[PDB]
Amino acid sequence: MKRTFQPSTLKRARVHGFRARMATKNGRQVLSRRRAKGRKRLTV
Amino acid sequence: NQERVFKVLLGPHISEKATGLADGKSQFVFKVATDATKLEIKKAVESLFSVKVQRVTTLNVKGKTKRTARGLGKRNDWKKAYIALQPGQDLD
């Protein structure tokens, strides 16, 4: 039956994208923390 | 510009679908620069081969992806233009 994940690219970018994280103040701290660990991606 | 004409063409492409195309019609396949418009390769054919061409179509190719140990390999991607000449003046 209906599993709990139905994919879409327009909903993914507006919630978890870069311009969404960079807009707020918590999200810019999510960027610096995830960058300074050294991850390859930063924008899932 | 004085330049920018000697940049937008990177040679022919000849293969099974391009060999039969240039014989039955007059259409020649060039592996053009990575970002060029339909005007500025209409001019770079009239300047570098001295022939008149009626119209030009283009398309983009995605690079094929290899999967091996210790990496994924994305090959380079590239544009491609079919140059449809006049019925005379097949080019070189």
Binding site: - | E3, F6, G11, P12, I14, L48
Partner: protein, 60 residues
């Protein structure tokens, strides 16, 4: 070389020189795409020769 090019020629004369070896760069990209280029040393040489004449123009 570079000491040759600083002999004055001009802004225009060396400015004519660039449109010469862009032809020689064009013909070496056409022959490589086809089957006939053995002198692979020539192909990596005019890249280092266009760079010289652009240097002696953006400075004097």
């Amino acid at each position: 070389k570079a000491n040759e090019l600083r002999e004055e020629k001009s802004g225009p004369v060396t400015g004519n020189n660039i449109s010469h070896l862009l032809r020689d760069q064009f013909n070496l990209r056409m022959q490589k795409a086809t089957g006939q280029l053995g002198q692979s040393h020539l192909l990596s040489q005019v890249k280092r020769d266009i760079a010289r004449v652009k240097t002696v123009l953006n400075q004097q």
